[PDB]
Amino acid sequence: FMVSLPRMVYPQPKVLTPCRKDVLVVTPWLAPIVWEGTFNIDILNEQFRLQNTTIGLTVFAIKKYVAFLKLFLETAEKHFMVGHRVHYYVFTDQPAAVPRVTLGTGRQLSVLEVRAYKQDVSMRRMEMISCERRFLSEVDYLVCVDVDMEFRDHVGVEILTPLFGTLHPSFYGSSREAFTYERRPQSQAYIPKDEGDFYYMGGFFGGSVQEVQRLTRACHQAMMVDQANGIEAVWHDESHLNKYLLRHKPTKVLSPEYLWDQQLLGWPAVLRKLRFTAVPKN
Amino acid sequence: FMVSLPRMVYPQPKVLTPCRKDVLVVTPWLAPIVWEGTFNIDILNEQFRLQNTTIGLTVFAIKKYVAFLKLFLETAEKHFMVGHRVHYYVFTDQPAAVPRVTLGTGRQLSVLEVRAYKQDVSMRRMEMISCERRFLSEVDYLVCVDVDMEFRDHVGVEILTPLFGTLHPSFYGSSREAFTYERRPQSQAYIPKDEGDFYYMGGFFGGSVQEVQRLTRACHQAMMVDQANGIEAVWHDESHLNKYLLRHKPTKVLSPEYLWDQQLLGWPAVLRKLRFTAVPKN
Ligand SMILES: O=c1ccn([C@@H]2O[C@H](COP(=O)(O)OP(=O)(O)O)[C@@H](O)[C@H]2O)c(=O)[nH]1
Ligand SMILES: O=c1ccn([C@@H]2O[C@H](COP(=O)(O)OP(=O)(O)O)[C@@H](O)[C@H]2O)c(=O)[nH]1
Ligand SMILES: OC[C@H]1O[C@@H](O)[C@H](O)[C@@H](O)[C@H]1O
Ligand SMILES: OC[C@H]1O[C@@H](O)[C@H](O)[C@@H](O)[C@H]1O
Ligand SMILES: [Mn+2]
Ligand SMILES: [Mn+2]
Numbered sequence: 001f002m003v004s005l006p007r008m009v010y011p012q013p014k015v016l017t018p019c020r021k022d023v024l025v026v027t028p029w030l031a032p033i034v035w036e037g038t039f040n041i042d043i044l045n046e047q048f049r050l051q052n053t054t055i056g057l058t059v060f061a062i063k064k065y066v067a068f069l070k071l072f073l074e075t076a077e078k079h080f081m082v083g084h085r086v087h088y089y090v091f092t093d094q095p096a097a098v099p100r101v102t103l104g105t106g107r108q109l110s111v112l113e114v115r116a117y118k119q120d121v122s123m124r125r126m127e128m129i130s131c132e133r134r135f136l137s138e139v140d141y142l143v144c145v146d147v148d149m150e151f152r153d154h155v156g157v158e159i160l161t162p163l164f165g166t167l168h169p170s171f172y173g174s175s176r177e178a179f180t181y182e183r184r185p186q187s188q189a190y191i192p193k194d195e196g197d198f199y200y201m202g203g204f205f206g207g208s209v210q211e212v213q214r215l216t217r218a219c220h221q222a223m224m225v226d227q228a229n230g231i232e233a234v235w236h237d238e239s240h241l242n243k244y245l246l247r248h249k250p251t252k253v254l255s256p257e258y259l260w261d262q263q264l265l266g267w268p269a270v271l272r273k274l275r276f277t278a279v280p281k282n
Numbered sequence: 283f284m285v286s287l288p289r290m291v292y293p294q295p296k297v298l299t300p301c302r303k304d305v306l307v308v309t310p311w312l313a314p315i316v317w318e319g320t321f322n323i324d325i326l327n328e329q330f331r332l333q334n335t336t337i338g339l340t341v342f343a344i345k346k347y348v349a350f351l352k353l354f355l356e357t358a359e360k361h362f363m364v365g366h367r368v369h370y371y372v373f374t375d376q377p378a379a380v381p382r383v384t385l386g387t388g389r390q391l392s393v394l395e396v397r398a399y400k401q402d403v404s405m406r407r408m409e410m411i412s413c414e415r416r417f418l419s420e421v422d423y424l425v426c427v428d429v430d431m432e433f434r435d436h437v438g439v440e441i442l443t444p445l446f447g448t449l450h451p452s453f454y455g456s457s458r459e460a461f462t463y464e465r466r467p468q469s470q471a472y473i474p475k476d477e478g479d480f481y482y483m484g485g486f487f488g489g490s491v492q493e494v495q496r497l498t499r500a501c502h503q504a505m506m507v508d509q510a511n512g513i514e515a516v517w518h519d520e521s522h523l524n525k526y527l528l529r530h531k532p533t534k535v536l537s538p539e540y541l542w543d544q545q546l547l548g549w550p551a552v553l554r555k556l557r558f559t560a561v562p563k564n
Contacts, residue, residue, distance in 0.1 A: 001496075004529040009476050012458045013310050015449065016552070021303045028295050028322035029329065030440060030534070032312040040310035043531070047311065158312060167297065176294045194291050214283075247286040249325070252312070270298070 005046050022270060027197065027253055031161075035255045036272040039158045045083065048157040054085040055160065056139035056209075058129060059147045061090060062114070062121050066097040068147045068279060073101040073109075079151035079275070087139055091128060122202075123223055123236045130216035135209045142212040145276070146203035149259075153275040161252040163207040163215065165200035165245045169256040169265055174199070182239040187231050188222035189239035191246060200245050202238030204259045204276065207251075218244055287328050304552060309479065309535055313443075317537045318554040321440045327365065330439040336367040337442065338421035338491075340411060341429045343372060344396070344403050348379040350429045350561060355383040355391075361433035361557070369421055373410060404484075405505055405518045412498035417491045424494040427558070428485035431541075435557040443534040445489040445497065447482035447527045451538040451547055456481070464521040469513050470504035471521035473528060482527050484520030486541045486558065489533075500526055 018025070019037040026032055057080065061069050069090065080086065088109040090098055093116035103109060112131065117124055125144070135142055141160050171179055176196040182189035206212060219240040226233060233239035257271055261278040300307070301319040308314055339362065343351050351372065362368065370391040372380055375398035385391060394413065399406055407426070417424055423442050453461055458478040464471035488494060501522040508515060515521035539553055543560040 002530060005531070007474070007477060010310075013306060013479055014457075015306045015315070015454045015480070016304070018300075018303060018306050021300060022298070024295060024297045024300050025308050026314050026320055028292075028320075029325045030314040030316070030321055032308050032314065033297070034312070038308055038310075039312055043311045047531070172297045175296075192289070195289060197295055198297070248284060249287070249329070 002047075003050055005043075005050070008042065008046070010040055010042060023255070027249070029249045031249065031251050031253055033167075033253045033255055034158055034258070036257060041154070041156060041158060044157050048084065048160065051140075052085065053141070053157065053160065054087060054139045055081050055157075056087045056089060056135060056142045058089045058091065058125075058142060058144045060114075060121070060125055060128075061092045061094075061098070061147045062116050063093065065147050066092060066094050068149070068281075069097075070099040070101065071150050071279065072147050073099065075151035077101065077104060077107070079153060080155050081157065084157060089131070091125075119232065119236050126216040126220040126223065126237055126240070130213055130220055132213055135213070139209060141206060142209050143206035144204075144212065144216075148279050148281055149203070149276055150279055151276055153273045155258065155275050159206070159252065159254055159258070161207065161250070163211040163245075163248065163250045164205060164252040164254055165198070165241070165250045166204035166254040166259045167256050168199045168201040169260050171199035172256050179242075180235060181242055182233040182235070184231065186229065187233050187239070188225050189233040189243045191243055196242075196246060197249070198245075198253065200238075200242055200250075200253075201259045202235070202241050204254065205241060205245075215241075215244055215248070284329075285332055287325075287332070290324065290328070292322055292324060305537070309531070311531045313531065313533050313535055315449075315535045315537055316440055316540070318539060323436070323438060323440060326439050330366065330442065333422075334367065335423070335439065335442065336369060336421045337363050337439075338369045338371060338417060338424045340371045340373065340407075340424060340426045342396075342403070342407055342410075343374045343376075343380070343429045344398050345375065347429050348374060348376050350431070350563075351379075352381040352383065353432050353561065354429050355381065357433035359383065359386060359389070361435060362437050363439065366439060371413070373407075401514065401518050408498040408502040408505065408519055408522070412495055412502055414495055417495070421491060423488060424491050425488035426486075426494065426498075430561050430563055431485070431558055432561055433558055435555045437540065437557050441488070441534065441536055441540070443489065443532070445493040445527075445530065445532045446487060446534040446536055447480070447523070447532045448486035448536040448541045449538050450481045450483040451542050453481035454538050461524075462517060463524055464515040464517070466513065468511065469515050469521070470507050471515040471525045473525055478524075478528060479531070480527075480535065482520075482524055482532075482535075483541045484517070484523050486536065487523060487527075497523075497526055497530070 086107040091112045179199040181191040368389040373394045461481040463473040
């Protein structure tokens with residue numbers, strides 16, 4: 001049950017003025033595409049706080065990638081769901097290498113030890129995410145991200161929805177035939193040249209716990225099939241995520257504001273904010 | 283559980299071209315505003331058929347308004363949720379005056395006899411809608427409309443969502459201070475001049491059965507309070523609907539395509555289609 005919003009004073013939305021005219025702000029299946037200027041964060045904050053929403057954030061830091069956790073977590077503290085309940089889940093082969101990061105109130109961190117693999121590290125995240133009962137008991141939404149990243153600006157409840165993917169920053173202006181989907185029919189991830197909505201980035205997806213369990217289960221089952229058949233998708237888990245989201249349309253799509261690489265792509269005018277960005281690495 | 287969509291061939295959405303640049307297509311709380319050009323109905327049809335969705339449509343035809351049912355129902359047959367399961371619920375004081383209208387397969391009609399009131403006819407719909415157990419057993423969504431209307435074009439599953447309202451065709455270009463909300467603080471429907479997103483039309487709202495029961499319960503309770511206090515809102519149930527939807531934001535908003543009056547307002551260029559329209563009356 002959702003109680004009433006309180007009185008709020010904010011600018012009237014005007015139907016005969018769009019804020020954003022430069023970009024597509026809704027998918028053809030009526031999912032919002034989240035850009036700056038499309039949301040009033042005060043209204044969304046009220047809505048989600050009235051539900052006491054808890055957001056879980058998963059991150060893998062295996063082998064040398066433990067080095068990325070300090071900046072990841074410190075900047076998450078500045079920018080990620082501030083004001084909301086947050087539970088970080090750090091999956092690592094080196095529990096003792098997890099930095100001691102000071103958290104704001106209502107935020108917690110759990111360290112989950114996993115085995116290190118010798119592509120497989122990236123690909124095994126789906127299996128490892130699909131800690132199932134734990135998440136259902138502890139959080140409302142799961143957000144699943146790469147560790148070699150930093151938050152530079154607001155990443156908040158505007159992302160939350162049953163199922164979301166993020167537009168890959170190298171492909172948002174590309175035609176579908178250019179997308180690097182898996183193109184071999186022998187793979188479970190196969191997508192023909194005349195199919196596809198978007199090319200989603202494997203490093204930032206999420207949703208409700210139920211929908212995230214569904215996705216990671218389906219992608220892990222599809223990768224197992226490929227394994228059995230002696231085929232490895234061109235972009236590993238990302239290929240499978242793309243096949244899933246083609247057949248199960250996300251209920252929001254995040255703009256490239258939410259997964260950017262300023263060294264490789266600069267700062268185009270279409271991006272008002274650079275919210276979550278790649279950290280330079282070998 | 284939602285099974286996979288089948289392969290489909292359709293135009294790629296392009297992120298750096300919006301279809302609609304002339305109008306706001308998403309609210310500041312990230313609800314789509316449904317205009318022609320914003321949706322691919324093939325994708326939406328697939329999604330909703332995979333769920334075997336059943337849509338209930340409520341209409342009141344009391345006293346002389348029974349005359350409007352033939353055209354209402356015949357045009358609903360041509361345009362309303364065609365291909366989906368539909369259950370019409372016709373609330374009337376004259377069961378024998380309900381015309382015999384031939385229905386397509388998978389569609390049914392029930393006649394529910396009510397008492398006629400001597401404003402009260404309009405206002406009592408909320409109470410009468412909130413047949414509660416019946417709807418929960420028989421339909422997935424409820425759509426609640428005025429009878430003095432005709433379908434002229436497609437009205438389909440693009441509307442379905444947990445909770446929707448429709449932009450009133452006289453006010454979609456107006457500033458909020460011009461909206462005819464109830465302005466007396468003594469009414470439960472009161473909305474101050476600096477509040478309000480939109481002015482929703484009382485003649486077309488809906489949602490999931492749960493959310494529609496919530497709305498009609500809340501509006502009926504608020505009208506009872508007003509009654510007890512000797513105040514009748516300026517626009518009756520519509521005033522209360524507007525207060526509800528201010529405090530409980532709809533998950534889609536329908537454009538004025540979905541409730542138009544061509545005699546009073548013509549056919550502006552911003553309306554690509556006129557889908558559900560007023561029938562001329564005294
Ligand atoms: O040795 C490794 C390789 C990968 N990863 C995790 O897998 C994610 C995906 O790998 P990576 O970021 O290297 O892919 P890229 O973004 O360079 O294509 C990383 O962010 C880490 O979260 C890891 O923890 N250790
Ligand atoms: O005598 C009446 C008055 C109203 N209504 C029902 O209440 C709705 C709202 O009334 P009306 O359409 O007259 O409001 P208007 O659109 O003229 O302001 C009507 O469409 C009918 O569905 C009715 O059935 N009989
Ligand atoms: O073409 C797909 C690839 O594009 C790269 O820019 C990215 O580093 C890879 O991880 C993969 O997403
Ligand atoms: O101002 C509100 C009113 O606007 C009229 O156009 C309509 O006929 C009324 O039923 C009411 O909605
Ligand atoms: Mn990465
Ligand atoms: Mn009417």
